[PDB]
Amino acid sequence: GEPAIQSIARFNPDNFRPVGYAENIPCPDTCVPEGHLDFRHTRLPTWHADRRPF
Amino acid sequence: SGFGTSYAHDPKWIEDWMARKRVGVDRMDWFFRAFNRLRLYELFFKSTPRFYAFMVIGGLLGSYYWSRFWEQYWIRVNKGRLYKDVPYVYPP
Numbered sequence: 815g816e817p818a819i820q821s822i823a824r825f826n827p828d829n830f831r832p833v834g835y836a837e838n839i840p841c842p843d844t845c846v847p848e849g850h851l852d853f854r855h856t857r858l859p860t861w862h863a864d865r866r867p868f
Numbered sequence: 869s870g871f872g873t874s875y876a877h878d879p880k881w882i883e884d885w886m887a888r889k890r891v892g893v894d895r896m897d898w899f900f901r902a903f904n905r906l907r908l909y910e911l912f913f914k915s916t917p918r919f920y921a922f923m924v925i926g927g928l929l930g931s932y933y934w935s936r937f938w939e940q941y942w943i944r945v946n947k948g949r950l951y952k953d954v955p956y957v958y959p960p
């Protein structure tokens with residue numbers, strides 16, 4: 815008894831998501847997970863010597 | 869463990885290896901500190917024309933003495949087996 819306009823509106827592809835989409839799909843917060851080396855670990859000490867000459 | 873399967877994962881000793889980040893440690897700073905005292909950057913590298921001259925004049929001198937060093941190495945290794953080392957005695 816639903817108006818056909820309302821019935822066909824539900825079957826929009828945006829209304830279908832696989833069961834469990836929200837509990838499985840990864841949601842990365844960074845491309846460098848914790849425990850991986852990055853610039854914050856390789857930066858030289860502030861008392862270092864110029865590296866341009868070499 | 870799990871090597872060779874879909875369960876493969878980094879062993880503990882690899883995890884410990886990657887836990888050593890050496891943050892704030894510089895054991896080779898002495899080398900750069902002493903190298904900078906040669907003033908190569910101030911004198912040669914900084915200016916492009918002098919940078920070229922270093923490559924050209926360095927290559928000139930370097931090539932000659934590089935050849936000179938290994939020529940002596942060859943003469944030492946083959947001592948007694950070179951034409952110059954064994955003067956020929958003419959048959960009587």
Ligand SMILES: CCCCCCCCCCCCCCCCCC(=O)OC[C@H](COP(=O)([O-])OCC(O)COP(=O)([O-])OC[C@@H](COC(=O)CCCCCCCCCCCCCCCCC)OC(=O)CCCCCCCCCCCCCCCCC)OC(=O)CCCCCCCCCCCCCCCCC
Nearest residue numbers: 858868889890893894895896897898899900903906908926
């Ligand atoms: C023209 C003259 C002008 C005037 C005079 C100039 C005079 C100066 C000349 C200087 C010449 C260069 C000397 C080396 C300088 C230091 C190294 C360097 O480049 O530093 C930049 C940089 C420093 O590292 P960093 O991480 O920036 O350091 C940060 C902090 O400073 C410190 O950070 P950290 O403390 O946290 O440490 C991090 C890092 C620090 O990094 C390092 O220190 C590691 C890299 C060191 C490389 C050392 C290179 C030495 C050059 C070879 C000389 C050969 C002489 C042969 C003589 C033959 C004569 C005919 O260390 C590590 O990651 C740890 C693991 C290191 C493993 C290294 C394994 C090497 C084993 C060697 C065994 C040798 C056994 C020989 C037995 C022989 C028996 C007879 O290192 C590199 O990038 C170098 C490695 C790159 C890959 C090597 C490529 C190998 C393939 C080529 C093979 C053939 C070799 C031909 C040799 C040609 C020589 C001309």
Ligand SMILES: CCCCCCCCCCCCCCCCCC(=O)OC[C@H](COP(=O)([O-])OCC(O)COP(=O)([O-])OC[C@@H](COC(=O)CCCCCCCCCCCCCCCCC)OC(=O)CCCCCCCCCCCCCCCCC)OC(=O)CCCCCCCCCCCCCCCCC
Nearest residue numbers: 902903905906907908910911912918919921922923925926
């Ligand atoms: C707590 C830890 C402590 C650690 C300690 C570690 C120690 C570090 C170790 C490293 C060495 C340290 C040395 C300490 C010296 C202390 C004394 C001092 O005050 O030094 C003066 C001074 C230090 O600088 P500074 O006092 O701080 O002043 C900073 C200025 O910005 C720079 O001064 P400047 O530029 O105003 O005056 C320098 C001036 C000093 O000389 C003069 O002022 C003389 C001026 C002439 C006076 C009138 C003379 C008339 C008669 C001439 C008769 C002779 C003619 C023939 C000459 C032929 C020469 C070939 O000229 C030079 O030295 C040479 C540059 C000349 C002009 C360059 C531009 C022209 C165009 C170049 C084109 C580019 C390509 C060139 C070719 C490159 C190679 C292929 O200069 C130097 O020590 C630098 C030397 C530069 C020459 C090249 C060095 C590279 C070769 C190294 C080989 C290493 C071999 C390793 C063997 C290993 C065996 C196991």
